[PDB]
Amino acid sequence: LAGLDTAIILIAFIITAAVLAYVAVNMGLFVTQKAKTTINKGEETASTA
Amino acid sequence: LAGLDTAIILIAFIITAAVLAYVAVNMGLFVTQKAKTTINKGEETASTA
Numbered sequence: 001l002a003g004l005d006t007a008i009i010l011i012a013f014i015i016t017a018a019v020l021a022y023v024a025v026n027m028g029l030f031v032t033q034k035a036k037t038t039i040n041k042g043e044e045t046a047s048t049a
Numbered sequence: 050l051a052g053l054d055t056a057i058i059l060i061a062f063i064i065t066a067a068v069l070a071y072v073a074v075n076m077g078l079f080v081t082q083k084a085k086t087t088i089n090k091g092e093e094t095a096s097t098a
Contacts, residue, residue, distance in 0.1 A: 004088055011095040019098075 008091050008095045
């Protein structure tokens with residue numbers, strides 16, 4: 001009996017966590033590149049005159 | 050005397066039990082396959098997104 005309903009919920013919870021993982025990594029890659037670009041623009045702003 | 054009327058009732062009771070046996074096995078085969086199908090559809094439902 002219980003060796004099935006539990007397995008289904010496990011499948012669903014794994015997929016749910018994998019979806020957060022997917023989003024978090026993508027958005028970390030995005031934001032860290034925005035930071036890289038900003039740091040470059042800050043140095044350009046301080047240097048150029 | 051009694052070696053005949055008893056035999057007839059035995060025949061009838063055997064047939065009666067055999068009829069329940071026939072139905073119970075058929076319906077067990079049916080319902081367990083519905084369960085198999087349901088378990089598959091549950092896993093498909095939890096996995097697909």
